[PDB]
């Protein structure tokens, strides 16, 4: 129908042009030509307000650059590959703290000297993501070895020895799994298996285990997705067990959708849309001012985090992907409508048409709380990945309406 | 440029949809689910009129499929993947006649038996492109080995021992080089070098050599491109020596553009444009009925080939790519206009706006000469490739002009 088609073409045009714009911001402001890597502590105008290198964002930016370079012809330029390679080098040299050991630092000084180390696998995950993409664009085996080796390091750490990360558990701390873990691991499994039967086959068992774990966070007879649950998949008590993050449930949701799409498993896909897309959104959406809450408490109690009611950029970018994907997958037009809802709200609320890129932090009412375009937790990732994926999905959708 | 970004969007939309259409044709009619491989002998309606498998086109199709699969998201579907793999397996099992040796048959029976062997390298050339592409989408090393091993064999055949190709030398035969050899060689060099720093550097010199040979076909002080020249890059006599093909000149032209795209030589770029684009078009375009002549004689003598005046699909598909790429590399409007001129003519004359895909043979008047959509020399290549590239090229142009 013309109605549908025109709206999609419009949106595909909107996100595509936006990607060009947000990418332009990172291309002209975040490149550290003197030491390699990127500056993410960028002000509203792109001015660097700090020269620290947050490992997460470096890995993410490298992956993003490569990803675009090989998927979107308009991004197949040397500037991207040069920056991406210079980024991988930086990671290759300084990412690791004591660099036999694979444990990576959370943040490094501009020159690559470790400043902080986080007892998690997050820096490492993005490290392996950037490594694998660099290999995809240069075919240099050293990148894939770095990637696969780190991957196996992470698997071991997560499934066989939490020790390699530190923080021996106190007899009082409850053994709880954070959703981010299976999600990230699953993300990796998907990243590596992409166009690689060997790797896809190698981590098949892990991919399943990961999806299964993520599903274990669906609690209260399928009425709540809980950020944390016991290692055995049971609801925890206290603020810890009641903690919710809608933005995260949606992201896990689309990660799961991606995992099952190939599995032509409409059963799983259905359940995921219900419990990971609609439920979180319905609970998370702020009826009074629009936008998804950052945090929530399953029992409806006031969250403990000061910033729970803030509207952050990534839960929305992830909502856009998850809905467009769910629709692309089930054709259920309700999801298309939700995508439109989320997409209009975030495009209207987070974009900064003055300088480029998007603000990442708004107060509950949707007003800009922080003017920074990048920082300790915001880089060239969530936004550009969301725009790229939507652009792709739309392109594919308008190909069946034509 | 609003006055221009319009037709461009128009064309990008037209080529993308057309590509969807032509691809749909091949996907639904060409697959051989019994012995693998594709049927290229299809009538105007997709009906098979012969089950012979022409190695050239078999390799071209497996190449096309994979290329689309990984570069255009909407084609990133199982159908294309499984089909290309079956095509590749088919090629792996029968392309080679004496399957110790590397010589590939020219035509095989539906089940893979050699029917005829062309004393050339073309079959092997496309086998190479198909295997390399199969590597890029499965990461299966066996495919890459097959590719590189063949590439090396081909190089030997044209640079060291052409005798392996067979074809006895005769005292009256003049030693000559046909532009198609350095052309196919350069095409393979660009192909293998894609996102592969190793192979890129490894064949870098050969790349430079081919380009040089090709350029050696420009004669009469840049006033003519000759299909055949002596090994010494000198004009031969007779019909052979004056033989021209505006389609290959234009093809060579963009091959060179892509190649020297890294170099950046504006002097060479201007040259290739002038002699491989404007020249072949200026003298090969049918003023009376529009369209590029198939063959022409450098001396303006009536060709000896019966079909010399026939308007074929691939000279035009190659012209669209060339002009568009030239405008992209030089920004000269004169070239953009020529793209429109060619694009308009080929879309209007070759498209079969009832069954899909294009007719490949029209009489000089532009009327359909043959109604086949595929045959001994027409497969899933020149059209989908031309469309896909123009799409990508228009996307990049629109993004920087917007």
Swiss-Prot record, chains A, B:
Its EC number is 5.1.3.8. Residues 185-206 are annotated as: Leucine-zipper. Optimum pH is 6.8. Gene3D superfamilies: 1.50.10.10. GO terms for molecular function: identical protein binding; N-acylglucosamine 2-epimerase activity; peptidase inhibitor activity. Kidney, liver, adrenal, and pituitary glands the amount being much greater in kidney than in the other tissues. InterPro entries: 6-hairpin_glycosidase_sf (IPR008928), 6hp_glycosidase-like_sf (IPR012341), AGE/CE (IPR010819), AGE_dom (IPR034116). It comes from the Eukaryota. Pfam families: GlcNAc_2-epim. Pathway: Amino-sugar metabolism; N-acetylneuraminate degradation. Activity of the enzyme is enhanced about 20-fold in the presence of ATP. CDD domains: AGE. Optimum temperature is 47 degrees Celsius. It is an enzyme of class 5 (isomerase). SUPFAM superfamilies: Six-hairpin glycosidases (SSF48208). PANTHER family: N-ACYLGLUCOSAMINE-2-EPIMERASE. This is N-acylglucosamine 2-epimerase. It comes from Sus scrofa (Pig).
């Amino acid at each position: 129908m013309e109605k549908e088609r025109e709206t999609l073409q419009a949106w595909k045009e909107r996100v595509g042009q936006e990607l060009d714009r947000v990418m332009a911001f990172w291309l002209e402001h975040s490149h550290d030509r003197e030491h390699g890597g990127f500056f993410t502590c960028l002000g509203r105008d792109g001015r660097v307000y700090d020269d620290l290198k947050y490992v997460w964002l470096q890995g993410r930016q490298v992956w993003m650059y490569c990803r675009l370079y090989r998927k979107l012809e308009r991004f197949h330029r040397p500037e991207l590959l040069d920056a991406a390679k210079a980024g991988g080098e930086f990671l290759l040299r300084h990412a690791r703290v004591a660099p036999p050991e694979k444990k990576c630092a959370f943040v490094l000084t501009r020159d690559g000297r470790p400043v902080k180390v986080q007892r998690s696998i997050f820096s490492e995950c993005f490290y392996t993501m950037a490594m694998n993409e660099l290999w995809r664009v240069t075919a240099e085996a050293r990148y894939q070895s770095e990637a696969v080796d780190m991957m196996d390091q992470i698997v071991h750490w997560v499934r066989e020895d939490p020790s390699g990360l530190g923080r021996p558990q106190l007899p009082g701390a409850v053994a709880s799994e954070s959703m981010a873990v299976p999600m990230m691991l699953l993300c990796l499994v998907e990243q590596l298996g992409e166009e690689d039967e060997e790797l896809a086959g190698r981590y098949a068992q892990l991919g399943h285990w990961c999806a299964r774990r993520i599903l274990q966070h669906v609690q209260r007879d399928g009425q709540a997705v809980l950020e944390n649950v016991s290692e055995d998949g049971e609801e925890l008590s206290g603020c810890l067990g009641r903690h919710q993050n809608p933005g995260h449930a949606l992201e896990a949701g689309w990660f799961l959708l991606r995992h099952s799409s190939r599995s032509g498993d409409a059963k799983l896909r259905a359940h995921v849309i219900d419990t990971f897309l609609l439920l979180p959104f319905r609970s998370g959406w702020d009826a009074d001012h629009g936008g998804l809450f950052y945090f929530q408490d399953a029992d409806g109690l006031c969250p403990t985090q000061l910033e729970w009611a803030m509207k952050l950029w990534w839960p929305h970018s992830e909502a856009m992907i998850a809905f467009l994907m769910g629709y692309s997958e089930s054709g259920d037009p309700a999801l298309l409508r939700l995508f439109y809802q989320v997409a209009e709200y975030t495009f209207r609320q987070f974009r900064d048409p003055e300088y480029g890129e998007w603000f990442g932090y708004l107060n509950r009412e949707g007003k800009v709380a922080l003017t920074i375009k990048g920082g300790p937790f915001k880089g060239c990732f969530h936004v550009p990945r969301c725009l790229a994926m939507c652009e792709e999905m739309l392109s594919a959708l308008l190909s069946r309406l034509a």
